[PDB]
């Protein structure tokens, strides 16, 4: 454009234009998008808030001469490699004083954002940078995969020693180099560019090419090593810090791999996630099977399969989802989860209530429900429910929510039936659509997998507490065995409080109960049942057909056709066994609750548990054989005698008032152990031991 109000950004830096032509945001413009999203964050939390410019800081990161990452301020487009990173520092509602994270991204304008050894090495450095600091790592993927290429400085030299020079059609023997060809290389210092041997044929002194290496780096296997390196780096990152990646422009090969390795992924519509391009897949098979890469890695495929947790209409939408997602996550590894009080106070009843009659959306029980006669509040803070993996295995609902300001992961069960449709396969004319009915409250391979993925995703990086509104009465698919197994493993590994709650009108039968029982992880799990909930190995019908058969159904029909009404009797006899009262009597749940009062009970129970967990975790690197079980008992023996250990609000309150003081008792607890240990060491090797102490003078 000629003569515009302000400078033409796309002209000052043509790369910005090239990026837009690619249909994605120019890399150096992303920090700005995070500013806008953070600003929006505030505008939704408290509109009367006036942000200044120093509320958001973005410092590009590059490697210095020693290869160490350092902050710099240069002009966009100065990057010498196709990978860049920024260290962001933002003041946010949950972290007013500020929080940090790293943003690594491919520069789609630098060799089509390909991964070369330097890009790989940079990405690895940045990832390690974030991990050492316990800081989140955001990856913006816009690439073309591993960089490729041959040694061009060898194309105008290699000679072809044919069988008979006068018969090229008869084939050839091998490729060699002349004495002149060798001199060309020696002139460019590119001597060790190829491996060769000297052989004199019919007179001339030849140099057979054994192997072609190349002076240019990033031609083959070194790109593969680099890819393996960052793949491993990302696998580790996921277990260390919060990871998430946004696909803004295609993401290919190692690019797609990283998307999955970081687990949490948001896909912008139209930007495919592919291992290999459709063109390549065509040439291979036979004819033109696929018309677009969107048929291979498009949203309708990755979001539907669960690779993509969320979809975004554009780059800004994606960044906004990243930021909203981060608002439930600790500023950094091992910090308490970020409390964020909203207008919706903890002290209120739960309005929306399920009815054995009318069908409902679990989300209503979760986040509340908007109606004509007004809004009906749900179990968690209004507007705090952030659903993820919503395009996959809809039989189960997954997301983050807030309880009186306390963030946590929530897993619910969709009661309505799902109509998972699967498009035909382009690589087989003999195949049509396939509508699959997925019954509610039943566990299918996908539901189980999604359930396991959620637990692991709440646990790793996010380090959140969790509540599962357990309401399953079966399983039918036999891979289910494998994925169900993933659930137990996921729970065994959970490190923050877990709450399992069978809601009103809900039930948990046989296998369904098994996979979520508190004993799987007694260190963190507690189970509760609504007074209007049902639970048992078998449902009434099943129990009847085994313990109340026509045989005995007659004996009672005597002491008192009339089969139907007597069938309804047997059912009630059974159903009277599946009550929460029996659950309390048998000791399988911590408590039976009343739905309307659950928001109040859980807020304090969870708050109390988070406070206690925090004290326990202070004894992690304690010396000795002390068990978690013995650690809480000890800590709890500290509470004032007049404090009721079963009064959640009271225990939470006292702890919150004595942090510093408790740290002291904790410190003194480890000190006793360190001494008791040194004692047992001397009383197990007095010789070398005693001498050791002596070796310690000053």
Ligand X SMILES: C[C@@H](Oc1ccc(Oc2ccc(Cl)cc2Cl)cc1)C(=O)O
In the complex, the smallest distance separating the C-beta of residue 216 from ligand X, rounded to whole angstroms, is 17
DSSP letter string over 442-459? -B-HHHHHHHHHHHHHHH
Q: What are phi and psi of 245, to 5 degrees?
A: -140, 145
Of its own copies, ligand X, none, which one sits near residue 65, judging by CB under 5 to 8 A according to partner kind? none
Q: Examine residue 214 and tell whether it contacts its own copies (CB under 8 A).
A: yes
In the complex, the smallest distance separating the C-beta of residue 406 from its own copies, rounded to whole angstroms, is 26
Residue 257 and residue 274 in contact, taking contact as beta carbons nearer than 8 Å = no
> How would you classify residue 679: left for phi > 0, otherwise alpha for psi between -120 and 50, otherwise beta?
alpha
* 549 is annotated as contributing to ligand binding: yes
Which of residues 221 and 641 has its CB atom nearest to its own copies in the complex? 221
Listed as own residue / partner, the contacts of 209-217 with beta carbons closer than 8 Å and 24 or more positions apart are: 209/158, 209/174, 209/175, 209/176, 209/177, 212/150, 212/151, 212/154, 213/151, 214/150, 214/151, 214/153, 214/154, 215/151, 215/153, 215/188, 215/190, 216/149, 216/151, 216/152, 216/153, 217/116, 217/117
* 343 is annotated as contributing to ligand binding: no
Which of residues 265 and 329 has its CB atom nearest to ligand X in the complex? 265
Of its own copies, ligand X, none, which one sits near residue 583, judging by CB under 5 to 8 A according to partner kind? its own copies
Which of residues 62 and 525 has its CB atom nearest to its own copies in the complex? 525
Size of site (CB under 6 A) for ligand X: 22
- State which of residues 12, 21, 49, 160 lies at the interface with its own copies (CB under 8 A): 160
Q: Examine residue 579 and tell whether it contacts its own copies (CB under 8 A).
A: yes
Of ligand X, its own copies, none, which one sits near residue 232, judging by CB under 5 to 8 A according to partner kind? its own copies
Q: Is 167 exposed, middle or buried (0-12, 13-18, 19+ CB in 10 A)?
A: exposed
Please compute, for residue 579, the number of CA atoms within 13 A of its CA located in the half-sphere on the CB side. 10
Of 17-25, 250-258, 522-530, 669-677, which part binds ligand X (CB under 6 A)? 250-258
In the complex, the smallest distance separating the C-beta of residue 403 from ligand X, rounded to whole angstroms, is 26
- State which of residues 51, 275, 316, 643 lies at the interface with its own copies (CB under 8 A): 275
Q: Examine residue 166 and tell whether it contacts its own copies (CB under 8 A).
A: no
- State which of residues 78, 492, 537, 633 lies at the interface with ligand X (CB under 6 A): 537
In the complex, the smallest distance separating the C-beta of residue 427 from ligand X, rounded to whole angstroms, is 18
Residue 380 and residue 389 in contact, taking contact as beta carbons nearer than 8 Å = no
- State which of residues 177, 246, 278, 515 lies at the interface with ligand X (CB under 6 A): 515
Residues 323-362 interacting with ligand X (rule: CB under 6 A): none
- State which of residues 352, 548, 595, 604 lies at the interface with its own copies (CB under 8 A): 548
Q: Which residues sit directly before a break in the chain (C to N > 2.5 Å)?
A: 477, 560
Q: Examine residue 511 and tell whether it contacts ligand X (CB under 6 A).
A: yes
Report how far residue 604's alpha carbon sits from residue 409's, in angstroms, rounded to the nearest whole number: 17
Q: Examine residue 272 and tell whether it contacts ligand X (CB under 6 A).
A: no
- State which of residues 484, 497, 518, 540 lies at the interface with ligand X (CB under 6 A): 484
469-487 burial: b if 16+ Cβ within 10 Å, else e: bbbbbebebeebeebbebb
Q: Any idea what DSSP says for residue 496?
A: S
552: enclosing H helix or E strand:
helix 550-559
Three-state helix/strand/coil letters over 250-319: CEECHHHHHHHHCCCEEEECCCCEECCCHHHHHHHCCCCCCCCCHHHHCHHHHHHHCCCCEEECCHHHHH
* 631 is annotated as contributing to ligand binding: no
In the complex, the smallest distance separating the C-beta of residue 111 from ligand X, rounded to whole angstroms, is 13
* 579 is annotated as contributing to ligand binding: no
Q: Examine residue 510 and tell whether it contacts ligand X (CB under 6 A).
A: yes
In the complex, the smallest distance separating the C-beta of residue 212 from its own copies, rounded to whole angstroms, is 4
Contact string (CB under 6 A) for ligand X, positions 436-455, x = contact: -------x----x-------
Of its own copies, ligand X, none, which one sits near residue 168, judging by CB under 5 to 8 A according to partner kind? its own copies
What token pair was written down for 571?
């059912």
Residues 195-224 interacting with ligand X (rule: CB under 6 A): 224
- State which of residues 510, 594, 653, 665 lies at the interface with its own copies (CB under 8 A): 510
Of its own copies, ligand X, none, which one sits near residue 448, judging by CB under 5 to 8 A according to partner kind? ligand X
Contact string (CB under 6 A) for ligand X, positions 141-160, x = contact: ----xx--------------
End-to-end CA distance of the chain: 76
Q: Examine residue 254 and tell whether it contacts ligand X (CB under 6 A).
A: yes
Closest among 305, 470, 316, 304 to 396, alpha carbons compared: 470
* 148 is annotated as contributing to ligand binding: yes
Residue 455 and residue 490 in contact, taking contact as beta carbons nearer than 8 Å = yes
Report how far residue 23's alpha carbon sits from residue 26's, in angstroms, rounded to the nearest whole number: 9
Please compute, for residue 223, the number of CA atoms within 13 A of its CA located in the half-sphere on the CB side. 18
Report how far residue 672's alpha carbon sits from residue 686's, in angstroms, rounded to the nearest whole number: 20
Which of residues 26 and 472 has its CB atom nearest to its own copies in the complex? 472
Residues 669-688 interacting with its own copies (rule: CB under 8 A): 671, 674-675, 678-679, 688
In the complex, the smallest distance separating the C-beta of residue 483 from ligand X, rounded to whole angstroms, is 7
In the complex, which residue's CB is closest to ligand X? 484
> CA-CA distances (angstroms) from residue 462 to 66, 259, 336, 456?
33, 17, 11, 9
Of 252-260, 616-624, 661-669, 675-683, which part binds ligand X (CB under 6 A)? 252-260
Q: Examine residue 280 and tell whether it contacts its own copies (CB under 8 A).
A: yes
* 470 is annotated as contributing to ligand binding: no
In the complex, the smallest distance separating the C-beta of residue 446 from ligand X, rounded to whole angstroms, is 11
Closest among 453, 450, 458 to 477, alpha carbons compared: 450
Strand partners, 110: none
Which of residues 286 and 374 has its CB atom nearest to its own copies in the complex? 286
514: enclosing H helix or E strand:
helix 510-514
Q: What are phi and psi of 573, to 5 degrees?
A: -65, -40
Report how far residue 573's alpha carbon sits from residue 505's, in angstroms, rounded to the nearest whole number: 18
Strand partners, 59: 87
* 256 is annotated as contributing to ligand binding: no
Q: Examine residue 666 and tell whether it contacts ligand X (CB under 6 A).
A: no
Q: Examine residue 148 and tell whether it contacts its own copies (CB under 8 A).
A: yes
Q: Examine residue 393 and tell whether it contacts ligand X (CB under 6 A).
A: no
Which of residues 336 and 423 has its CB atom nearest to its own copies in the complex? 423
Residue 595 CB coordination number (10 Å): 21
Q: Examine residue 563 and tell whether it contacts its own copies (CB under 8 A).
A: no
Report how far residue 115's alpha carbon sits from residue 228's, in angstroms, rounded to the nearest whole number: 12
Q: Examine residue 229 and tell whether it contacts ligand X (CB under 6 A).
A: no
In the complex, the smallest distance separating the C-beta of residue 395 from ligand X, rounded to whole angstroms, is 11
Which residues sit in the known binding site for acetyl-CoA?
146-148, 511
Binding positions for ligand X, rule: CB under 6 A: 145-146, 224, 227, 252-254, 257, 275, 443, 448, 475, 480-481, 484, 487, 510-512, 514-515, 537
């Amino acid at each position: 454009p000629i003569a515009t109000p302000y400078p033409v950004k796309e002209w000052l830096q043509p790369k910005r234009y090239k990026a837009h032509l690619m249909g994605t945001t120019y890399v150096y413009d992303f920090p700005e998008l995070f500013r806008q999203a953070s600003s929006s964050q505030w505008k939704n939390f408290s509109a009367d808030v006036k942000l200044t410019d120093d509320f958001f800081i973005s410092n590009e990161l590059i490697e210095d001469e020693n290869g160490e990452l350092t902050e710099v301020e240069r002009e966009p487009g100065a990057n010498a490699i196709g990978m860049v990173a920024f260290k962001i520092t933002v003041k946010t509602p949950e972290y007013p004083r500020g929080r940090q994270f790293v943003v690594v991204a491919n520069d789609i304008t630098f060799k089509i954002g390909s991964f070369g050894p330097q890009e790989d090495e940079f990405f690895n450095k940045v990832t390690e940078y974030a991990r050492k600091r316990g800081i989140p790592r955001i990856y913006l993927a816009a690439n073309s995969g591993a960089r490729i290429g041959m040694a061009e400085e060898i194309v105008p030299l290699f000679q072809v020693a044919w069988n008979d020079a006068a018969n090229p059609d008869k084939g050839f023997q091998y490729l060699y180099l002349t004495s002149e060809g060798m001199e060309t290389l020696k002139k460019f210092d590119k001597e060790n560019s190829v491996l060769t041997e000297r052989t004199v044929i019919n007179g001339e002194e030849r140099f057979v090419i054994k192997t072609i290496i190349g002076s240019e780096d990033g031609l083959g296997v070194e790109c593969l090593r680099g890819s393996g390196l960052i793949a491993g780096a990302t696998s580790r990152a996921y277990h260390d810090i919060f990871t998430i990646t946004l696909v803004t422009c295609r993401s290919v090969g190692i690019g797609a791999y990283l998307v999955r390795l970081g687990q949490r992924a948001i896909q912008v519509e139209g930007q495919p996630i592919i291992l290999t391009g459709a063109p390549a897949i065509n040439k291979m098979l036979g004819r033109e099977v696929y018309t677009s890469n969107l048929q291979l890695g498009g949203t309708q495929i990755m979001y539907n399969n669960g690779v993509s947790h969320l979809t975004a209409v554009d780059d800004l939408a994606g960044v906004e989802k990243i930021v909203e997602w981060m608002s439930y996550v600790p500023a950094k590894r091992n910090m308490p989860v970020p409390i964020l009080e909203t207008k919706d106070t903890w002290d209120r009843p739960v309005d929306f209530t399920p009815t054995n009659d009318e069908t409902y959306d679990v989300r209503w029980m979760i986040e509340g429900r908007e109606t004509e006669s007004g809004f009906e509040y749900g179990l968690f803070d209004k507007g705090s429910f952030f659903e993820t993996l919503s395009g996959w295995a809809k039989g189960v609902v997954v997301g983050r929510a807030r309880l009186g300001g306390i963030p946590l992961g929530v897993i619910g069960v969709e009661t309505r039936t799902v109509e998972n449709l699967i498009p035909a396969d382009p690589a087989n004319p003999n195949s049509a659509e396939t509508l699959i009915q997925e019954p509610g409250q039943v566990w299918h391979p996908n539901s189980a997998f999604k359930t396991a993925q959620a637990i692991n995703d709440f646990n790793n990086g996010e380090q959140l507490p969790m509540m599962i509104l357990a309401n399953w009465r079966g399983f039918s698919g036999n891979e289910v065995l494998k994925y169900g197994s993933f659930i137990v493993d996921a729970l065994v590994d959970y490190k923050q409080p877990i709450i399992i709650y069978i809601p009103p009108t809900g039930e948990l039968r046989g296998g369904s109960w098994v996979v979520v029982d508190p004993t799987i992880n007694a260190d963190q799990m507690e189970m509760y049942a609504d007074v209007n909930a049902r639970a048992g190995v078998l449902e009434p019908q099943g129990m009847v057909g085994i313990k109340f058969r026509r045989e005995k159904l007659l004996d009672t029909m005597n002491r008192l056709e009339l089969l139907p009404i007597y069938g309804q009797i047997s059912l009630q006899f059974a159903d009277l066994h599946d009550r929460s009262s029996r659950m309390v009597a048998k000791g399988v749940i911590s408590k039976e609750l009343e739905w309307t009062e659950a928001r109040r009970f859980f807020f304090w129970r969870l708050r109390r548990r988070l406070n206690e967990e925090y004290l326990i975790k202070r004894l992690s690197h304690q010396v000795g054989e002390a068990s978690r079980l013995e650690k809480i008992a000890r800590i709890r023996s500290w509470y004032p005698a007049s404090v009721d250990h079963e009064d959640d609000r009271q225990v939470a309150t006292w702890i919150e008032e004595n942090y510093k003081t408790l740290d002291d008792k904790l410190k003194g607890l480890k000190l006793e152990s360190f001494a008791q240990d040194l004692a047992k060491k001397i009383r197990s090797d007095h010789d070398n031991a005693i001498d050791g102490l002596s070796e310690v003078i000053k």
